[PDB]
Amino acid sequence: KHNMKAFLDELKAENIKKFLYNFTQIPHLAGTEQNFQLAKQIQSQWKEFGLDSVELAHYDVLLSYPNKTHPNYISIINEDGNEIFNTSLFEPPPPGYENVSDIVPPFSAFSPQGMPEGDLVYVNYARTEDFFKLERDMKINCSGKIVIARYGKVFRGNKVKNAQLAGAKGVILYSDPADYFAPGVKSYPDGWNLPGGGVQRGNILNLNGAGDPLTPGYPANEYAYRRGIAEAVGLPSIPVHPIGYYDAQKLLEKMGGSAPPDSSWRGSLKVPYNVGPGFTGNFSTQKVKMHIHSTNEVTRIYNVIGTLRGAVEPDRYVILGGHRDSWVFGGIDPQSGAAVVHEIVRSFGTLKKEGWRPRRTILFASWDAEEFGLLGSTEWAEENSRLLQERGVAYINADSSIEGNYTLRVDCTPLMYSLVHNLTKELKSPDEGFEGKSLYESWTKKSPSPEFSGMPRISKLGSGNDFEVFFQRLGIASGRARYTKNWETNKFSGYPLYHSVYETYELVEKFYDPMFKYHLTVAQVRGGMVFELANSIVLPFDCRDYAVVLRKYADKIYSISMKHPQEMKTYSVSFDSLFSAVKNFTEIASKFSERLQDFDKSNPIVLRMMNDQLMFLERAFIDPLGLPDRPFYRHVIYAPSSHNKYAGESFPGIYDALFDIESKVDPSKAWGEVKRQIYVAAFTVQAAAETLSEVA
Amino acid sequence: KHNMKAFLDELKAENIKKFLYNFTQIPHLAGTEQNFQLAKQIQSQWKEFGLDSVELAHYDVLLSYPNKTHPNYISIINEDGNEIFNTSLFEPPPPGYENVSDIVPPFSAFSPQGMPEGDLVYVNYARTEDFFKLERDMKINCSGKIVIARYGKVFRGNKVKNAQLAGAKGVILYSDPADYFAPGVKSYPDGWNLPGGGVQRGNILNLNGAGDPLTPGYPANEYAYRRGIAEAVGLPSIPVHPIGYYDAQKLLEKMGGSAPPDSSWRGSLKVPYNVGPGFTGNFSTQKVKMHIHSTNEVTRIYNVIGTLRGAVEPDRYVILGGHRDSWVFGGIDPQSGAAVVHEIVRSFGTLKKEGWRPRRTILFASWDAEEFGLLGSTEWAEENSRLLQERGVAYINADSSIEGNYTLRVDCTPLMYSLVHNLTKELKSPDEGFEGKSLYESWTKKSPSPEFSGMPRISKLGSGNDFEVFFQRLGIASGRARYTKNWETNKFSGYPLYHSVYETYELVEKFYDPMFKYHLTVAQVRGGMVFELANSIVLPFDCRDYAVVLRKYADKIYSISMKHPQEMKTYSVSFDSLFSAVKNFTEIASKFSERLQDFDKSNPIVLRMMNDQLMFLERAFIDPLGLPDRPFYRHVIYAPSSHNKYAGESFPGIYDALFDIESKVDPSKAWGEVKRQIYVAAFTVQAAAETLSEVA
Ligand SMILES: *[C@@H]1O[C@H](CO)[C@@H](O[C@@H]2O[C@H](CO)[C@@H](O[C@@H]3O[C@H](CO[C@H]4O[C@H](CO)[C@@H](O)[C@H](O)[C@@H]4O)[C@@H](O)[C@H](O[C@H]4O[C@H](CO)[C@@H](O)[C@H](O)[C@@H]4O)[C@@H]3O)[C@H](O)[C@H]2NC(C)=O)[C@H](O)[C@H]1NC(C)=O
Ligand SMILES: *[C@@H]1O[C@H](CO)[C@@H](O[C@@H]2O[C@H](CO)[C@@H](O[C@@H]3O[C@H](CO[C@H]4O[C@H](CO)[C@@H](O)[C@H](O)[C@@H]4O)[C@@H](O)[C@H](O[C@H]4O[C@H](CO)[C@@H](O)[C@H](O)[C@@H]4O)[C@@H]3O)[C@H](O)[C@H]2NC(C)=O)[C@H](O)[C@H]1NC(C)=O
Ligand SMILES: *[C@@H]1O[C@H](CO)[C@@H](O[C@@H]2O[C@H](CO)[C@@H](O[C@@H]3O[C@H](CO)[C@@H](O)[C@H](O)[C@@H]3O)[C@H](O)[C@H]2NC(C)=O)[C@H](O)[C@H]1NC(C)=O
Ligand SMILES: *[C@@H]1O[C@H](CO)[C@@H](O[C@@H]2O[C@H](CO)[C@@H](O[C@@H]3O[C@H](CO)[C@@H](O)[C@H](O)[C@@H]3O)[C@H](O)[C@H]2NC(C)=O)[C@H](O)[C@H]1NC(C)=O
Ligand SMILES: *[C@@H]1O[C@H](CO)[C@@H](O[C@@H]2O[C@H](CO)[C@@H](O)[C@H](O)[C@H]2NC(C)=O)[C@H](O)[C@H]1NC(C)=O
Ligand SMILES: *[C@@H]1O[C@H](CO)[C@@H](O[C@@H]2O[C@H](CO)[C@@H](O)[C@H](O)[C@H]2NC(C)=O)[C@H](O)[C@H]1NC(C)=O
Ligand SMILES: *[C@@H]1O[C@H](CO)[C@@H](O)[C@H](O)[C@H]1NC(C)=O
Ligand SMILES: *[C@@H]1O[C@H](CO)[C@@H](O)[C@H](O)[C@H]1NC(C)=O
Ligand SMILES: *[C@@H]1O[C@H](CO)[C@@H](O)[C@H](O)[C@H]1NC(C)=O
Ligand SMILES: *[C@@H]1O[C@H](CO)[C@@H](O)[C@H](O)[C@H]1NC(C)=O
Ligand SMILES: *[C@@H]1O[C@H](CO)[C@@H](O)[C@H](O)[C@H]1NC(C)=O
Ligand SMILES: *[C@@H]1O[C@H](CO)[C@@H](O)[C@H](O)[C@H]1NC(C)=O
Ligand SMILES: *[C@@H]1O[C@H](CO)[C@@H](O)[C@H](O)[C@H]1NC(C)=O
Ligand SMILES: *[C@@H]1O[C@H](CO)[C@@H](O)[C@H](O)[C@H]1NC(C)=O
Ligand SMILES: [Ca+2]
Ligand SMILES: [Ca+2]
Ligand SMILES: [Cl-]
Ligand SMILES: [Cl-]
Ligand SMILES: [Zn+2]
Ligand SMILES: [Zn+2]
Ligand SMILES: [Zn+2]
Ligand SMILES: [Zn+2]
């Protein structure tokens, strides 16, 4: 038969392994010839696999590259202007890749150019609370200083924004072994740890969902009108550069001024972690000098878009998308995901060649320029926003398949909780000790829900990947899944070799997943979700799961406000309308679920009428006016944290109105805005609930 | 049978006559007890007529009223401060209504309070070009002057905005007999002309689609957070008051300073129409003083919403809406429309009682507070925007049924041109001399299209009525129809008694439509359009008509730009992308129309898939970022003129970028914005075209 089992059985670990090897032999940096060649290869292969059409969609977007003949580096300079220490010009290449051409050296993409020279202030992780501690408590002023910040905890673009706002004239990012060196594990190539010469690449934009800096709101097509640089969205105003911990130790070791305020400011290097500013007595006349010569350049990028047309609802789209561009070899990020997508396409194509089609259309996407700010996914979504908003059922992301090998991670809309629970109960666990058990069983045992007994953890979607435009701008139900680390025992950030030259095929094959069993499990989770979404008669969304989470989020935001009881009294700040809206959503969702199970199952119009109510439910949380000063974050329930793009925040409008409210100079205005955000949230919740009422 | 003929035959002129009489005996000013009582009556009657449900939807919105014990008036004052002439406190009430309570005296709703005293400048119609003529050519400065402007040509809110921007400290609006007194016709009650004591009421806001000034973007419900007054949308900053031509003659007769620049500045009064500033020699020490004491007050308003549930697509809405609130008796505006809606509901209800239902749901609306800025329609649309944007097929307005008795007027989306042509060919003309001919025949003969032989004129939708939120904010196909004057021979603005106490049942019965035959014809046009929209298997929209008009609009905007050939060369301003997009839309629309006629007619999914493409076509012209500084005007092809809310403008983004461009101080920035608007228009046209392509 042609059912989900046939689809799942056709997926092969050996094929994913072959595809990963094929995708990781040379770098595929966005905007380069090598990445265009890979796009053409994937287009050809998807056509051979059996898709109905496979096209390239190209855009000309702002990218950023170092200057090949004027390299970026940081110096310590003495008072005579002699450069007495210089940071590395490149990462030592891994074994057997020492002759590989076009490895981009470490840089912070979109840094402006400059040669700032000054005294160093150490700012821990450069989080909002680290700057509060510096300014408010320690009385240390970052104005005109170069700040040095360790990577980890929050997206690097937020670190840069924070340092800017503090008055820094430059930022040095580094990987501390505390965050990137797991105890008892060897450095690459002998283990999966970051060596002292390893460096994390990555963009430092603050786009807030805009896509290409030059064309916010519209696709960067052939006739696009571009903003000038000075009006571009999200570019940093001060030079920024990343270094490894051998170079960081040389910059930190001479630091003087104030002691670190507490142990949470100390990494693992043999240095005092003094905050500064500047160096101790003997070295006090020395300074730090950055030399950044990178350039921003409008550059063509290419998405591959494959279509498998639906048999019954060809105007309903289920999208499986992940990116193809990499910083260097992309052994994990993204090619561990792209190899999984490739095998998924191949499996669907095998069924299609035997005469099967899914009920709904499935679109497959190989996005470009994700590493430069989600640029390929967002420009294509801007070009196709009308089709997506009226026909888009769901988006399933497919970046890295592994960030560890311990258990499953899922982040998604509450509309997909039941789907995920049900699918994982039918899949085999790949874990040692769980032979013959379900994936649901091993995942729930290893990663218990903080709320419910015998349920697994599912997180909110944050951001920092290609689902952002589909979920927080367009309101299309979205999800992601991968294998992850043991969250109890592993205190490090992500995986140690993230966005380094050392992220290779060998890293994966030797240290993460030699049997490709975790990759296969992730292909079964992502593929199975796409299968159910595209083939289930009734869309596999449970609106009642949204009701449960809305109450949890309402309790949470109310609890934050309730730290200020005097102000709530004075300004008559009530959450009554929001709780009322959540109560109503709960009631209306229950009655809808009854209809959904009791409706005349012979009637396709009642069915699609009810499928449209299911599809447009995520869409109902969109506010066309967007969130304050973030017009492309339009979802009222979920936005990326204003302090950390990677983290989701619930009721973000209210959260940001309440954040550090006790420091606002005009409490009446600040609490008025809290009340405005309560109104907007309560209204949006009730309006979303009413989409599930009887239609007439 | 239950078909359109049965529906049309059930409509009776005598019933419309009875309903008009019933609706016009007392005033129904928005926010008053009398208008709430009428709402409850209409709710009860719609229930009796057979609708499935009939509810009141209420909102608390900012309204404006004169102070009953501190009346508004204008004086001439001598240099001792004696008030030697005062304008009237009220219009002389018409015969047999001299004892009617609660007639609101003439005022300009939403004027601020004040007692400005100064010299008079006469500004013709206070249009943008009148102020250009004054400032640029005549070198007359309106700063700190009271301006006196004749009504007509443009919406009065635009006059007020223009005078503000000119630095006026107050505005006096008056009705000149040139614009409100048809030659050879008697003044009310002996004819349909405006008498010298008659005055036109009306709001002077500049809301640009926002709805209630205090709650832009969200419904003004029980828990709404309101802006403070100072942050409210669209309120005038200077006092404004309207007067009749007896009072205007007393203000104009002493005017000195400059002669009128030409005959187009002269009305029909026996005065010189001197521009000023101030009075001639002998009266030069005299001044004009306004006394305005009106107050803005948040006040409850009530929409009646009736539902006739669809048999097959109950989640598809066809809306027939018109307002119920009036300035005084509302004999034409709105009750000539509301009586027609009432008879339409009754006719549909008769069919329903016999076991018929329409294919799609029909919603019927009696809007409140239209006269105060489209407030009831817009607040309800804001509350229900998610349901409307995903389920709204079409909106048919139903304000005044007559503005004359010569021929038909239709303004609507190009998507409804074919519907209207076809429907009018099946209706009987009510015109003398056209007995036994079609309405199409009499309308085409009397009002030929300026473009095509043997076709009637259909105008673009402008604004100043309750379709604005549905069409220019939400992108729901919209239309309106009424009987109108002879446009060749009648040079006056609208009808003379517009928004006066004299607009009564007797006005209509004696002078406009004694037999109620024109009202019946308008009920057949509005009702027949609602019938076809709600019952036709395939939605009755022809996408190819949009293609034809898009080319006309592209030619028009290109022709405007081409008055500046040197600048187009210098700044490389090309319309190539827009013409390309229009060409593509034309091609894609043609192929869609073929599919629509050749599709397997047995397949409901291909049918509704194609009905959704038809429904979402108007929706595709919406830009979620809105037009520059007008976030609630989101339709890219059509917006109300920035110079006259009543007029539609095509490609408004490009039009406004080009307007008076030769006066801009920075031509490179101004032509850059023209190019940006070309890009936005070309992209939106192509994106709309692609919604009609094969879906997969
Ligand atoms: C969760 O869902 C419930 C419904 O189950 C909603 O309940 C509504 O709550 C509002 C209050 O926010 C109620 O509003 C009140 O309406 C009264 C009139 O209601 C009647 O008439 C209307 C038509 O106008 C019908 O729709 C309705 O069915 C009733 O027949 C008003 O008179 C009230 O105003 C008076 O009291 C208030 C409060 O003291 C004063 O401020 C006013 O000045 C005035 O004196 C009031 O506006 C509404 O009736 C409820 N609808 C119901 C029960 O069907 C919740 O609002 C919803 N939660 C959210 C967040 O939306
Ligand atoms: C009206 O509809 C037509 C289609 O019938 C659209 O035509 C497209 O027009 C654009 C130009 O705006 C063409 O863009 C060009 O694409 C070339 C590659 O096209 C091939 O590969 C792509 C995938 O990447 C396929 O989609 C496509 O089918 C082709 O197989 C590029 O190489 C071109 O760039 C080069 O030339 C330009 C111009 O000199 C330079 O600026 C560049 O630097 C570069 O050298 C160019 O981008 C596109 O191919 C056309 N599509 C077709 C024919 O299917 C119109 O755009 C549309 N009108 C509007 C307003 O949208
Ligand atoms: C995940 O799997 C669960 C468990 O199978 C699914 O819930 C079950 O769904 C079925 C089919 O809708 C329900 O059966 C229905 O029962 C009612 C009365 O109980 C009956 O009137 C209907 O005719 C129908 O038989 C079943 O009750 C329900 N079981 C539960 C909730 O425990 C669930 O829908 C799946 N989630 C998805 C698909 O997203
Ligand atoms: C307004 O009325 C006109 C005139 O009747 C309508 O156009 C006509 O629509 C019919 C039905 O779709 C067309 O018939 C079709 O003809 C094609 C080939 O000619 C055939 O393959 C189909 O099976 C079908 O019979 C007819 O051609 C067409 N006539 C025209 C355009 O002159 C029109 O659709 C109406 N407008 C509406 C409903 O909005
Ligand atoms: C990745 O796999 C592809 C597909 O097998 C390889 O590309 C093929 O290479 C052969 C020999 O050069 C050609 O004859 C084919 O035309 C190619 N096919 C396509 C679709 O491009 C590619 O060589 C492999 N890359 C690596 C690094 O192994
Ligand atoms: C307008 O018509 C309505 C409906 O016929 C009249 O209201 C009715 O009046 C009678 C007598 O007062 C009552 O017994 C009914 O209960 C009323 N019905 C409703 C639905 O309100 C109303 O009197 C008429 N108004 C005018 C000015 O003639
Ligand atoms: C890169 O550096 C070289 C060598 O100093 C210089 O000539 C060139 O302009 C730079 N490239 C840029 C700015 O793209
Ligand atoms: C650092 O680099 C600069 C630029 O090439 C050079 O002048 C300096 O000698 C170098 N310093 C060291 C310690 O190698
Ligand atoms: C920080 O630095 C500059 C002085 O160079 C000054 O403008 C700013 O106000 C300082 N802020 C403090 C000490 O809080
Ligand atoms: C993968 O699993 C093995 C065996 O459980 C373990 O030794 C190894 O550390 C894991 N690798 C990573 C990178 O976590
Ligand atoms: C209206 O005028 C009276 C009489 O002078 C005054 O007492 C009252 O305050 C005014 N009403 C308002 C401002 O609503
Ligand atoms: C105009 O009205 C004021 C206010 O009541 C009064 O003082 C004045 O005498 C009136 N003037 C005339 C000419 O009636
Ligand atoms: C108009 O009036 C005022 C003087 O009262 C002045 O500020 C303004 O610049 C004048 N403009 C002219 C004469 O153009
Ligand atoms: C209505 O029609 C009659 C007869 O054609 C005409 O005398 C009258 O002026 C018309 N009324 C209006 C208000 O145009
Ligand atoms: Ca863009
Ligand atoms: Ca509002
Ligand atoms: Cl992912
Ligand atoms: Cl109308
Ligand atoms: Zn990635
Ligand atoms: Zn990455
Ligand atoms: Zn009206
Ligand atoms: Zn009116």
The total of structural domains in chain B comes to: 3
CATH number where B435 lies:
3.40.630.10
Is there a contact between B64 and B295 (Cβ–Cβ < 8 Å)?
yes
> Closest to A315 (Cβ–Cβ): which among B612, B682, B687?
B612
Tokens of B584: 């593509």
Nearest CA owner, ligand 6 atom 17:
B41
3-state secondary structure B238-280: CCEEEECHHHHHHHHCCECEECCCCHHHCCCCCCCCCCECCEC
Two tokens, residue B274: 């001197």
H or E segment and range at residue B287 = strand B287-291
In whole angstroms, give the CA distance from residue A664 to residue A242.
34
Number of H helices, E strands in chain A: 21, 19
Alpha-carbon torsion (B135, B138, B144, B150), positive or negative: negative
Alpha-carbon distances of B244 from A36, B65, B248, B251, B332, rounded to whole Å: 74, 19, 6, 11, 20
Spatial distance between the Cα atoms of A218 and A220, rounded to a whole number of angstroms: 7
Helices (H), A50-153: 128-132
CB A241 within 8 A of CB A258: no
Q: What is the dihedral of CA B116, B120, B122, B123, to 10 degrees?
A: -40
> What are the backbone dihedrals phi and psi of residue B146, each rounded to the nearest 5 degrees, phi first?
-90, 130
* Among candidate residues B261, B292, B323, the one where a domain is terminated: B292
Among B600, B606, B635, B683, pick the best mutation site for testing chain A contact (most A Cβ within 10 A): B683
Round to whole Å and give the CA distance between A125 and A107: 18
Judge if the upstream peptide bond of residue A334 is cis by omega within 30 degrees of 0: yes
B-chain CB neighbours of A623 within 8 Å are 217
N residues, chain A: 696
CATH of the domain at B163: 3.50.30.30
Closest CA to A537 of A593, A446, A610: A610
Give the whole-angstrom CA distance, residue B302 versus residue B372. Answer: 13
B344 and B492 housed in the same domain: yes
- The DSSP secondary structure of B222-237, one letter per residue, reads TTPPPPPGGG-SS--S
Helices (H), strands (E): how many in chain B?
21, 19
CA–CA dist B365, A248 (Å, integer): 70
Q: Which amino acid is present at A124?
A: N
Report the alpha-carbon distance of residue A441 to residue A423 in Å, rounded. 12
Partners of residue A307 on adjacent β-strands: A53, A363
A248 and A116: one domain? yes
DSSP SS3 for A341 = helix
- Can you say whether the dihedral through the CA atoms of B453, B454, B459, B460 is positive or negative? negative
Site of tokens 């969702």: A589
User: What is the distance between the alpha carbons of residues B205 and B232, in angstroms, rounded to a whole number?
Assistant: 11
DSSP H/E element including B15? helix B13-23
d(CA B26, CA B101): 8
Cβ distance B419 to B540 under 8 Å? yes
Whether B617 and B672 map to the same domain: the answer is yes
Point out the ligand 13 atom lying closest to the alpha carbon of residue B144: 5
Q: How do A202-203 and B83-86 pair as beta strands?
A: unpaired
Distance, CA of A285 to CA of A254 (rounded, Å): 12
Residues A469 and A344 in one domain: yes
Q: Cβ–Cβ of B680/A218 closer than 8 Å?
A: yes
φ, ψ (nearest 5 deg) of residue B466: -70, -10
Query: Residue B337 is encoded by which pair of tokens?
Result: 């429309």
Q: What is the DSSP string of B43-104?
A: HHHHHHHT-SEEEEEEEEEEEEE--TTS--EEEEE-TT--EEEE--SSPPPPTT-TT-S-PP
CATH code (residue B629) = 1.20.930.40
Same domain flag for B512 and B624: no
What is the C-alpha separation between B84 and A439, in angstroms, rounded? 93
Strand B360-367 relative to strand A638-641, pairing: unpaired
Residue positions counted in chain B = 696
Nearest CA to B694 out of B583, B582, B606 is that of B606
The residue from A284, A574, A577, A593 that is catalytic is A574
User: Which residue segment(s) compose the domain that A213 sits in?
Assistant: 67-292
CA nearest neighbour of B424 among B398, B394, B445, B450: B445
Beta bridge partners of B202: B108
The helix (run of H) or strand (run of E) holding residue A523 is helix A517-535
Q: How far is CA A211 from CA A298, A373, A394, A489, in A?
A: 13, 6, 20, 36
**Contact partners, residue B21, CB within 8 Å, separation at least 6:** B505
Residue A355 amino acid letter = G
What is the greatest pairwise CA distance in chain A? 87
Residue-wise DSSP of B172-191: EEE--HHHH--TT-PBTTSS
| Domain stops at, among A509, A540, A571 | A540
Task: Find the closest chain B residue to A692 by CA distance.
Answer: B387
Please tell me the distance from the alpha carbon of residue B666 to that of residue B385, in angstroms, as a whole number: 40
Instruction: Look at residues B684, B634, B611, B688 and name the one whose alpha carbon lies nearest to residue A612.
Output: B611
Residue B364 has φ and ψ, to the nearest 5°, of -115, 130
Give bridge partners of residue B149 from the DSSP assignment. B173
Distance, CA of A165 to CA of A169 (rounded, Å)? 10
Quote the radius of gyration of chain A (alpha carbons, Å). 25
Q: Which of B41, B49, B56, B100 to mutate to test the pocket of ligand 6 (most atoms within 8 A of CB)?
A: B41
Examine the residue annotation and report whether A612 is marked as an active-site residue of this protein.
yes
DSSP string, B568-596: HHHTT---HHHHHHHHHHHHHHHHHHHHH
- φ/ψ of A109, rounded to 5, equals -70, 140
How far is residue B10's CA from residue B2's CA, in Å, rounded to a whole number? 11
Nearest to B415 by CA among B688, B600, B693: B688
Contact assessment for residue A175 and residue A199, using Cβ atoms and an 8 Å cutoff: yes
For residue A492, the SS3 value is coil
Look up residue B679 and give its two tokens: 């890009």
Going by DSSP bridges, is the β-strand pair A202-203/A287-291 parallel, antiparallel, or unpaired? unpaired
Contacts of B559 (CB under 8 A, 6+ apart): none
Of B330, B250, B286, the residue nearest B88 (C-alpha): B250
Which run of H or of E encompasses B476?
none
The answer to whether residues B302 and B246 belong to one domain is no
CB under 8 Å to B537, separation ≥6 — which residues? B359, B607
Beta bridge partners of A63: A297
Q: Are residues A501 and A577 in the same domain?
A: no
Question: Which residues make beta-bridge pairs with B308?
Answer: B362
Task: Give strand pairing partners of B75.
Answer: B86, B289
Kindly compute the dihedral angle of the four CA atoms of residues B249, B255, B259, B264, in this order, to the nearest 10 degrees: -30
Asked if A314 and B383 come within 8 Å (Cβ–Cβ), the reply is no
Shared domain for B308 and B237, answered yes or no, is no
For residue B228, give every residue at least 6 positions away whose Cβ sits within 8 Å of its Cβ, in sequence order, or none.
none
The CA distance from A485 to B190, in Å, is: 90
**Measured between CB atoms, which of A225, A386, A620 is closest to B676?**
A225
Residue A622: helix, strand or coil by DSSP?
Answer: strand
Q: Cα(B651)–Cα(B629) distance, rounded to whole angstroms?
A: 16
Q: Which helix (H) or strand (E) holds B605?
A: helix B604-620
Distance of CA A199 to the CA centre of its chain: 20
Experimental method: X-ray
Q: Which residue is closest in CA terms to ligand 13's atom 11?
A: B141
Per the CB < 8 A criterion, the answer to whether A381 and A389 are in contact is no
Among the listed residues B370, B403, B506, B649, the single catalytic one is B370
DSSP A171: E
Q: Which two tokens stand for residue B376?
A: 């009831």
And the tokens for B586?
Answer: 């034309």
Q: Phi and psi dihedrals of A545, rounded to 5? A: -65, -30
What do you get for the CA distance between the two ends of chain B, in Å?
40
**CA distances from residue A295 to A31, A71, A229, A324, B427 in whole angstroms, order as listed:** 14, 12, 12, 23, 69
Are A370 and A288 in a shared domain? no
Q: Are residues A83 and A156 in the same domain?
A: yes
Distance CA A498, CA A500 (A): 6
Both B57 and B71 in one domain: the answer is: no
Q: Cβ–Cβ contacts within 10 Å for residue A94, how many?
A: 23
Ligand 13 pocket, mutate which of B132, B135, B143, B145 (most atoms under 8 A from CB) = B143
Q: For B194, left (φ over 0), alpha (ψ -120 to 50), or beta? A: beta
Closest ligand to C-alpha of residue B432 is 14
C-alpha B66 chain-centroid distance: 24
- Domain stop point among A235, A270, A292: A292
Q: Using alpha carbons only, what angle is made at residue A338 by residues A336 and A339, rounded to the nearest 5 degrees?
A: 65
In whole angstroms, give the CA distance from residue A89 to residue A560: 47
In angstroms, the Cα distances linking A400 to A324, A352, A409, A498 are 11, 27, 12, 11
Show the tokens assigned to B645: 């809310």
Whole-number Å distance between alpha carbons of B326 and B497: 13
- Residues preceding chain discontinuities in chain B with C to N over 2.5 Å: none
Q: Are A492 and A177 in contact (CB under 8 A)?
A: no
To one decimal, the resolution in angstroms is 1.4
Both tokens assigned to B617: 């076509």
- The values of phi and psi at residue A102, to 5°, are 60, 35
Cα distances from B375 to residues A467, B63, B302, in angstroms, run 38, 9, 10
- Residue of B386, B574, B625, B669 for testing the chain A interface, max A β-carbons within 10 Å: B386
CA dihedral sign, ordered B143, B146, B148, B152: positive
Residue B658 is encoded by which pair of tokens?
């080009």
In whole angstroms, how far apart are CA A35 and each of A39, A56, A323, A367, B44? Answer: 6, 13, 11, 11, 69
- B524 shares a domain with B593: no
CA-based Rg of chain B, rounded to a whole angstrom? Answer: 25
Residue A613 to residue A542: CA distance in whole angstroms = 11
Give the single-character DSSP code of B429. P
| Secondary structure (DSSP) of B617-654 | HHHHTB-TT-BTTBTT--BSSEEEETTEEEEEEESHHH
